[PDB]
Every structure is written in structure tokens, then in C-alpha cells.
């Protein structure tokens, strides 16, 4: 079978997809989108699942979809309608945030209340440790390339450790303009480019540390750091918790201190608070979880088709794949992994998991990247932690940036 | 604490309040993402409270349609009264139209309803039961046009605004998608159609439950996993895509008549059923999905329907003591149509008129329960559902034909 469909059945769908493709007729909406994404994701998911060299553990299926889908966009295999349809689902409909919102809610409302605050105290410093590692290693390789320290921090390290595109590139160019006075484009173009390259390496290393994790069990924790109506309620909660966090980060409490708190960061606090309040009955708490499983196990391959389209512009990467950037960026990511591994080990967490959540999930392209990374190491259950790095840890990088930027001038 | 437990859409009062307060915060501060998440957040919560309210009300629940009706009317009143903000209207509309949740919803419904029907029962049903249903529609048509001409009302209106909606598969299944076909063939507003259609259809549903008890007196007097569900979602979308491709590029029109893509879908999905390409496990998966929509997300959709597809003025204008007559006689035409057709096919006239007649003019599934309870024949639920579901899919095909040639 292909995604739970007998070969004959899948062919029916596959033929349908080709008919829509060749006649160039496809609704640019949810239905048209999911139809393509389901089918396309299905075949390449299975392929990735069975390619011997290509698939290793969890990373064999999602990574395949992701990379192949981006190659379809770059190669111009997708039609403008098809790209629009997938994009309409990812961004206009904003399936990405929904997906993450459901994950966060499902992951948090599953755990004990007492265990909650035990982590968050030790996590943030581990993230700082990863940044130090990312810095130290970056400057080390940078001097090896004859590149001044300032550039390494401004154009390499800070953007990579940034909260991704919307959260880091978009605001880090703002801070750059505010401190330097120079054009935002000059910065963002270089930043967005390099950050995407590191995001690629982050997804690669996530699978590497997964193999290493199952090979050296003492480092790994194996995915641990330290009726329909119920499922329907989980979906209400996933959206409603997102709405509240949204309202807080926009109009009530956009920033606690010098740090600006992203709405996803707030959501994590909100959902965790809702858990500790015990407002949700155990049945409903499970409903959230079962819904989160439906997304993480059924719709994950669909999301990846979208991730490969919207959030991986292969053109811009190639415009900056000078050997130099490729090496520097990659080693910065390694510095993050070793930074978070050391820091987490000292804090109490498993080195493998630490390096993934506080390391790779920091160097990745924020939320889209979190999904891409966590899916490569099958530790999708850490979405809540990955988001803390991308959102709260991302907010930290801006504060650091404003400091770093001023000193360099 | 006894009352703290009372549930609103499966949520204890205290929990719902959390959400209800969140909705008001988004409303007061005027901060809401105009996307899927923002939309569903509002629609879920709003639909929840008014769904229950409509559900609890005695006379309104059983004879008007209850919660789905309460939702789509109240929601339209929010738009008219200006209670919604321009953001909130945009968010809901973005879900309904730009994201096009409507079509997905319907696509899932059609697929789940058709593929749930056993392969044998479907093709068996077609030879005898299905033609009887067609005969009931003919009867419903002929009688409707007869009364319509007696009311000085053109034949177009009688078929489009009276007969077809009544014989339709109810509200979410017939009224909602018939408005789409109407817009796709005429070009006029959906809300003009739906507001009148939904109104008359509910009235006929009332007469259908009445006549069910009449024919009863007359009768006695004159003697297994999420993956399967996921596959259902693939199929629901893919079957829609194929029907889309057909109606746009391949086979836009059989003749002078234009076949709407939803019409084609029904044929496609029914063909897919008869091919038996889908294993029974997957066929159920499609059903279990259609359930999730029909029982969880139906109330959400109605919040949308009230916003875009509801003109509360036209609904008020349609409760004229003229339409009460027209609708009622259309139902009688269905009863006599199904009685004749069934008698020729081999079935009992009383039972035929109930299953292939009244169960067609009633409000889909909710109606079947209401009708088959009035006459003690609840054991015909399996037949009643064939009319409401397969017969309801037939009505869309006929509609797509009737609409085009009439325009
Ligand atoms: C304020 C909340 C911060 C902590 C959020 C993490 C809780 C949700 O995340 C959970 O963490 C657990 C403990 O590692 C893991 O067992 C689960 O895999 C994960 O779902
Ligand atoms: Na980053
Ligand atoms: Na009906």
C-alpha cells in the first residue's frame, strides 16, 4: 500500500492528480491543495521510507517529501496554480500555525502539571549555552576564513540563531537599519539566504543525532528530555489557546521586558497554565492528544509538501552556496549542537535531546524548521520545547543583536 | 458544583467560559487573525453556545431544525446587527470562501455518504428502490408545477426554489450545495437562493412528519485506525478534484446543459463505490470522517452559512401562507409519486411513500428520524438514509441540469 491505500486505489488518485496537472485545472483552495499534497506526499513519503541509503530512521519519509517538493518548485514542475493552491493552504489559510497550535496544545495537555515548571528553569540557560557555542565556533571558523568578527556575528551567527524568517530576518533587518542606517535589503537578503542553508544542515544533523542516539543510548533519551467530541474539543482548545496568545502578544502584553514575546511563546505559557488549572477533564486532555496524533501521523506528510514549497526557496540558497558560506554556516550549527549538549548535560537533560531542542531548533528556520527538524529525528513530541527556542529564544537573539549591532558600529 | 458540569459542545461550563472570554477579548481589543485559526476559533465558540441553545429549545428543536438553524439565523443577525467586526466577518468569510471550507465540507459529506453504502445495497438499490425515488421526484415536480401555475408563479421558481430544495438532502447536504450550483449556473447571489430554500424546505419537513402519521393511520385502516479516516480525506478531496477537472476541461457540458462539478463528483464517488476499489475498512474511514464533519464541524459551518448565505429578510418573506400550501402539496406529490412507483416495482405503497417519498422531502438525516418516528417504522432507517443520501446526491445532478436548461 501507499499511505494506507492499495496500489490500485492510489493509482486512481495519482491519475487524478496528473489529469488536474495536464489539463491545468485545480481549485486554488484547501480542497485543491490537500488533494495534491496528500497524493504527492504519499508517494514520495513511501519512497523516502524505503530508499536504503536515502532513508535512515524517521528522517526517510518527511525529508524526502520536503526536499523533493522544493525541487518541484525550483524545477518548475509545479504549475503556478499548484504552487498557489499549496501556498493558500500553508499561508493564506495558515495550516502551518494551526498544525503547530494543535501540536503544542496536544503535547502540553498530555503531561502532568507538577513536571511543568521543573524544565523551563533549566532550559533557557541551555539555549544561551548553545548560542555561546554557535558564536565561539562561528568566530573560530570565520577567522579561519579571514572574515572579521563583526560580519560573523551580524551576517552569520545571529541570523541563524534568530527566530527564523518572520521572527529573525524580518526584525533583525529592522534592528540593523535602526543601528547602522544601511538598507534592510542588503542585510535580509544575505541573512535569509544563509539561515536557510543552516536550516538544511539542521535537518540533516537531526537525523545524524538520531542515528547516534540509537547507537549510543547513554546520550539519548529516545524522545524524552529530562469519542470524536473529545477530539473536537481538542481542536477548539488548540485554536482558542492560539487566539488568546495572539491577543496577548499584539494588544495586551507584546513584550515583558527588553524582550518581545512571540504569540507562540505565549501560547505555550497559556496552554501550560490551562493544564495546571485542570479546567480540562482527563478525557478532553486525551482528546487534544489524539488530535495531535492525527496531525503528526496522518497530515505530517501533507505539511511537508507545503514546507518544501513555501519555506525553502532553492533559488536563493544557490545564490549563496559559495563553499565559504556552506562551511561556516554548517559549523555554526555544530557549535550550537555542542553548546546545547554541554549546557543541557550540566542542567540535567539528555545531550542528544538538548542539542536538538536548544541547539538545532535554534539554528533552524523557526516554526517551519522545527517541524522539519523534529520530523527528521522522529521526536515531534518536543514541538513545545522547539517552539520555546524558536520563539522565546528567538526574542533573546534580538536583544543580543541590538547589543552586538551597537558595539560593532 | 452540580451545574459547573453542564456541557457546551462537550466542554464543562467553566472550560467553555475560558474560551468565551477569549472570544470577547479578541472582540473587544479587535485583534483576530483573518485566517483559518482565527476563524475556527470564533466559529467554534459562537456556534457552540447557540447550537446548544437551539438544541435545548423544545418546539424549535424538533420542528424548525434546532441548533444548525439557531446558529445560521443568529449568525446572520450578528452581521446585520453589526455585532461582528469587519475583521471577524473577514475571518469567517476567509474560511468559507477564500480557504473554501464549504466545498471541502460538502466534498467530505458526499464521499462519506456514498462510500458508506454497501456495494451490493447500492447497485441492488438502483434497480428498484432508486427508480421509485425518481418517480417520487417526478410526482413532486408535476404536483408542484401544477400548484405553482395555480398560484401564478413561473415554472422556473417552482423547480429551483420549491421542488429541488425540498427533495434535496436537507440543509448542510442540499440547501448549502444547491446554492453553490445556483450561483455557478445563474451567477446570482447564493444568499438570495438559500434564504428562500432553507425556509420552504423546513416547512415541508414539518408536513412530512405530519403525513407520516397520516399514512400510518391510513395504513392500519386500509391494510480500524486514523489512517483509514485519513484515506477518506484523501478520497474526499481527490474525488472533488477529478470532478472539478471534468466539469472545467473534459466534459463541461453533455449537451446544451452544463453539469456542475459537484454533480459529477456524485457520479464519480458512486462509480468508485461500485468499482469496489476501496476496501470496506476504507469505506468506513470515509464515513467516520463525514461524521466528524457532520457532528463536530457542522455547527462551525453554520456560523459561516449565516454570515455569507443568509439574508434574514428573504426568509421572513417566504413564510407566506401561499408557500405553506405549495410546499405541502409538493410533499403530497412525492408521496403519490413514490406510492405509484413502488407499487409498480413490488413494494407496499404506504411504505414506499414513506421511504422514497417523505424521507426525500424531509430535512436529510435529522428528518428521517423525525418522520420514521411519527409512523412507527424506524426499522426503515437504512432505506430512508438511501433517499436522503444517494437520492440527495441525485437531486444535485438533476438540479445542475434543471438550473442550466431553465436559465
Ligand atoms: C511552561 C511549559 C514549558 C514546558 C513545556 C513542555 C511540556 C510539553 O511537552 C512535553 O514535555 C514532556 C517532558 O519532557 C515530554 O515527555 C513530552 O514528550 C512533551 O510532549
Ligand atoms: Na533560526
Ligand atoms: Na429533503
HEC readout, chain A: CCCCCCHHHHHHHHHHHHHHHHCCCCCCCHHHHHHHHHHHHHHHHHHHHHCCCCCCHHHHCHHHHHHHHHHHHHCCCCCHHHHHHHHHHHHHCCHHHHHHHHHHHHHHHHCCHHHHHHHHHHHHHHHHHHHHHHHHHHHHHHHHCCCCHHHHHHHHHHHHHCCCHHHHHHHHHHHHHHHCCCCHHHHHHHHHHHHHHHHHHHHHHHHHHHHHHHHCCCCCCCCCCCCHHHHHHHHHHHHHHHHHHHHHHHHHCCCCCCCCCCHHHHHHHHHHHHHHHCCCCHHHHHHHHHHHHHHHHHHHHHHHHHHHHHCCCHHHHHCCCCHHHHHHHHHHHHHHHHHHHHHHHHHCCCHHHHHHHHHHHHHCCHHHHHHHHHHHCCCHHHHHHHHHHHHHHHHHHHHHHHHHHHHHC
**SS in 3 state form for A10-23?**
HHHHHHHHHHHHHC
Distant-in-sequence, close-in-space partners of A344: CB < 8 Å, separation ≥ 6: A126, A129, A225, A350, A351, A353, A354, A355, A358
Indicate which atom in ligand 1 lies nearest the CA of residue A226.
14
**Which cell numbers in the block locate residue B99?**
480557504
Determine if residue B389 is labeled as part of a ligand binding site: yes
Asked if B230 lies within 8 A of A32 by C-beta distance, the reply is: no
DSSP code string of B287-303: HHHHHIIIIIIHHHHHH
What are the start-end ranges of the H helices in B292-380?
298-308, 312-317, 323-345, 349-352, 359-361, 364-374
User: Is residue A208 lining ligand 1, measured as CB closer than 6 Å?
Assistant: no
Contact B27, B88 (CB under 8 A): yes
Q: Max CA-CA distance within chain A? A: 65
Report the candidate in B133, B141, B39, B68 with the shortest Cα–Cα distance to residue B293. B68
Give the SS3 label for residue B346.
Answer: coil
Distant-in-sequence, close-in-space partners of A98: CB < 8 Å, separation ≥ 6: A238, A239, A242, B36, B37, B40
Give the SS3 label for residue B128.
Answer: helix
Distant-in-sequence, close-in-space partners of B85: CB < 8 Å, separation ≥ 6: B27, B30, B32
Kindly give the interhelix angle for B190-221 and B176-185, rounded to the nearest 10 degrees.
130
Determination method here? X-ray
**Ligand 1 atom 18: residue of nearest CA:** A381
User: Is residue A111 lining ligand 1, measured as CB closer than 6 Å?
Assistant: yes
Give the SS3 label for residue B251.
Answer: coil
Give the SS3 label for residue B7.
Answer: strand
Burial degree of B406 (CB within 10 A; 0-12, 13-18, 19+) = middle
Q: Does the CB of A97 have a partner CB in chain B at under 8 Å? A: yes
Breaks (C-N over 2.5 A) in chain A follow: 226
**Which cell numbers in the block locate residue A326?**
556552506
Q: Which residues pair with B12 in a beta bridge?
A: B7
Q: Does the CB of A143 have a partner CB in chain B at under 8 Å? A: no
**Which cell numbers in the block locate residue B391?**
437520492
Determine the Cα–Cα distance for residues B393 and B173; give it in Å rounded to an integer. Answer: 8
Determine the Cα–Cα distance for residues B129 and A90; give it in Å rounded to an integer. Answer: 45
**Which cell numbers in the block locate residue B200?**
420552504
Report the candidate in A383, A333, A384 with the shortest Cα–Cα distance to residue A362. A333
User: Is residue A386 lining ligand 1, measured as CB closer than 6 Å?
Assistant: no
Q: Provide φ and ψ at B335, rounded to 5°.
A: -65, -50
Determine the Cα–Cα distance for residues A331 and A197; give it in Å rounded to an integer. Answer: 11
Mutation choice for ligand 1 from A238, A347, A378, A385, CB with most ligand atoms inside 8 A = A385
Contact B391, B361 (CB under 8 A): no
Contact B160, B403 (CB under 8 A): yes
| Backbone CA torsion sign across B48, B307, B310, B400 | negative
**Ligand 1 atom 16: residue of nearest CA:** A224
**Residue A293 CB coordination number (10 Å):** 17
Q: For residue A206, give Cα distances in angstroms to A18, A51, A348, A379.
A: 34, 18, 20, 10
Mutation choice for ligand 1 from A104, A111, A383, CB with most ligand atoms inside 8 A = A111
Breaks (C-N over 2.5 A) in chain B follow: 223
Distant-in-sequence, close-in-space partners of B205: CB < 8 Å, separation ≥ 6: B65, B361, B362, B363, B367, B370
Q: Element (H or E) spanning B16, and its range?
A: helix B13-28
Give the SS3 label for residue B12.
Answer: strand
Q: Does the CB of A300 have a partner CB in chain B at under 8 Å? A: no
Q: Does the CB of A30 have a partner CB in chain B at under 8 Å? A: yes
Determine if residue B255 is labeled as part of a ligand binding site: no
DSSP code string of B47-111: HHHHHHHHHH-HHHHHHT--HHHHHHHHHHHHHHTT-S-HHHHHHHHIIIIIS-HHHHHHHHHHH
Distant-in-sequence, close-in-space partners of B305: CB < 8 Å, separation ≥ 6: B71, B72, B75, B96, B176, B194
User: Is residue A107 lining ligand 1, measured as CB closer than 6 Å?
Assistant: yes
Q: How far A21 CA sits from the closest chain B CA (Å)? A: 9
Indicate which atom in ligand 1 lies nearest the CA of residue A119.
4
Q: For residue A145, give Cα distances in angstroms to A190, A323, A328.
A: 17, 11, 8
Asked if A279 lies within 8 A of B228 by C-beta distance, the reply is: no
Amino acid at each position: 500500500k501507499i499511505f494506507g491505500m492499495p496500489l490500485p486505489l492510489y493509482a486512481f488518485a495519482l491519475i487524478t492528480l496528473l489529469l488536474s496537472h495536464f489539463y491545468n485545472a485545480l481549485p486554488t483552495d484547501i480542497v485543491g491543495g490537500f488533494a495534491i499534497m496528500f497524493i504527492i506526499g504519499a508517494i514520495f513519503g513511501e519512497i523516502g521510507k524505503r530508499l536504503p541509503i536515502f532513508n535512515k530512521y524517521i528522517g526517510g519519509a518527511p525529508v524526502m517529501i520536503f526536499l523533493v517538493a522544493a525541487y518541484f518548485v525550483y524545477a518548475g514542475i509545479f504549475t503556478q496554480k499548484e504552487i498557489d493552491a499549496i501556498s493558500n493552504v500553508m499561508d493564506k489559510s495558515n495550516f502551518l500555525n494551526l498544525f503547530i497550535a494543535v501540536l503544542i496544545t496536544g503535547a502540553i495537555l498530555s503531561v502532568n502539571r507538577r513536571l511543568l515548571l521543573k524544565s523551563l528553569l533549566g532550559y533557557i540557560p541551555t539555549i544561551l549555552m548553545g548560542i555561546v557555542g554557535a558564536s565561539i565556533f562561528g568566530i573560530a571558523i570565520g577567522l579561519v576564513f579571514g572574515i572579521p568578527v563583526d560580519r560573523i556575528m551580524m551576517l552569520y551567527v545571529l541570523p541563524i540563531m534568530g527566530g527564523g524568517n518572520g521572527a529573525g530576518a524580518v526584525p533583525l533587518s529592522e534592528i540593523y537599519h535602526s543601528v547602522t542606517g544601511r538598507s534592510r535589503e542588503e542585510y535580509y537578503s544575505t541573512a535569509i539566504a544563509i539561515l536557510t542553508i543552516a536550516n538544511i544542515f539542521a535537518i540533516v544533523f537531526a537525523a545524524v543525532l538520531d542515528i547516534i542516539g540509537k547507537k549510543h543510548t547513554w546520550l539519548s533519551g529516545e524522545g524524552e528530555l529530562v469519542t470524536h467530541r473529545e477530539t473536537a474539543v481538542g481542536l477548539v482548545l488548540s485554536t482558542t489557546c492560539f487566539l488568546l496568545a495572539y491577543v496577548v502578544a499584539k494588544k495586551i502584553l507584546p513584550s515583558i521586558g527588553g524582550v518581545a514575546i512571540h504569540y507562540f511563546a505565549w501560547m505555550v505559557l497559556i496552554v501550560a497554565a490551562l493544564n495546571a488549572s485542570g479546567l480540562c477533564s482527563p478525557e478532553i486532555k486525551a482528546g487534544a492528544k489524539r488530535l495531535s496524533d492525527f496531525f503528526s501521523k496522518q497530515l505530517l506528510w501533507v505539511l511537508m509538501v507545503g514546507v518544501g514549497v513555501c519555506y525553502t526557496d532553492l533559488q536563493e540558497i544557490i545564490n549563496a552556496i559559495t563553499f565559504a558560506n556552506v562551511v561556516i554556516a554548517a559549523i555554526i550549527v555544530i557549535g550550537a549542537v555542542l553548546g546545547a549538549a554541554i549546557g543541557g548535560w550540566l542542567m540535567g537533560f539528555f545531550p542528544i535531546e538538548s542539542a536538538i531542542t536548544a541547539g538545532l531548533c535554534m539554528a533552524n528556520r523557526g516554526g517551519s524548521g522545527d517541524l522539519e527538524v523534529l520530523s527528521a529525528c522522529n521526536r515531534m513530541n518536543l514541538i513545545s520545547y522547539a517552539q520555546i527556542s524558536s520563539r522565546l529564544g528567538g526574542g533573546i537573539v534580538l536583544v543580543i543583536a541590538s547589543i552586538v549591532f551597537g558595539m560593532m558600529i
